[PDB]
Design a binder for this molecule. Structure first.
Ligand SMILES: [Cl-]
Length: 275
């Protein structure tokens, strides 16, 4: 990695090399006292527009449930991209430590998930890949959901995505959100037959036929059971939409009231990096 820099504003926490944050460096920003992750791109021709595009796109996302961008810093060795770090670990990690969430707990996360996805949708020009199978959490009493919109199993894929040539990515996202909700409530993926889940034909098969089964021991209000059924619809034109979900009885219950660097300075830093 690159030798520590602005020691004076950031305290080196540790140098990671694997995870949802690729290869990176954790740092504590001395003022505001908070963890931050740093990514590094080599100064060479590796600094093309693609990188510029992603940096800007990520720099525009300003939402409490999204991994916010922080600042670019130039070191002779590399361009440093600094962003907020979700300490909390992964959502999926918390789900399987608990076995499964209570209905109320799942709603608490789903509300954040849908708010953050809705925001990304209103800010998407090409429909990036949220990778909703791997959302993170910050760290605190009521952990906050964090979606990773960076760039630098079959269960989450809607039937159309494989099925049809042209497919709306925003409808595909709702399906993915459905799968995450099922997982939170049930503790297992939506279409992974027990007998032999590791299988593939069987799982893809279930997806295409929408065969899912909330097990006996899992109890949930019928309003919740309705929402799920409106999400797991094979035909996209008929799948419930984000605006409708925000208006669903189940979603409304307990809905909380809630739910930088100059563009130039940034552009000036990327250019230099090109050398
Ligand atoms: Cl429970």
């Amino acid at each position: 990695l690159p030798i520590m820099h602005d020691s004076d504003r950031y305290e080196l926490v540790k140098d990671i090399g694997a995870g949802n944050f690729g290869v990176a460096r954790l740092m504590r920003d001395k003022q505001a006292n908070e963890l931050v992750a740093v990514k590094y791109i080599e100064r060479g021709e590796k600094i093309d527009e693609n990188v510029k595009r992603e940096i800007i796109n990520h720099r525009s996302l300003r939402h409490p449930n999204i991994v916010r961008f922080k600042e670019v810093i130039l070191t002779p060795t590399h361009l440093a991209i600094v962003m907020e770090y979700a300490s909390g670990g992964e959502l999926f990690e918390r789900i399987c430590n608990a076995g499964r969430f209570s209905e109320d707990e799942a709603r608490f996360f789903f509300q954040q998930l849908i708010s953050g996805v809705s925001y990304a949708h209103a800010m998407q020009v090409a429909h990036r890949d949220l990778k909703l199978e791997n959302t993170l959490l910050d760290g605190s009493p009521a952990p906050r959901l964090k979606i990773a919109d960076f760039g630098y199993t079959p269960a989450y894929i809607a039937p159309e995505v494989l099925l049809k040539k042209e497919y709306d990515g925003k409808v595909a996202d709702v399906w993915s959100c459905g799968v995450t909700l099922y997982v939170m409530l049930v503790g297992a993926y939506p279409f992974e037959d027990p007998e032999e889940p590791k299988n593939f034909r069987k799982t893809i098969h279930r997806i295409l036929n929408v065969q899912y089964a909330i097990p006996d021991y899992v109890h949930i209000s019928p309003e919740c059971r309705h929402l799920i059924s409106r999400i797991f619809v094979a035909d996209p034109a008929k799948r419930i939409s984000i605006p409708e979900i925000r208006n669903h009885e189940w979603f409304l219950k307990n809905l909380p009231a809630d739910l930088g660097q100059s563009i130039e300075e940034i552009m000036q830093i990327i250019a230099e990096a090109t050398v």
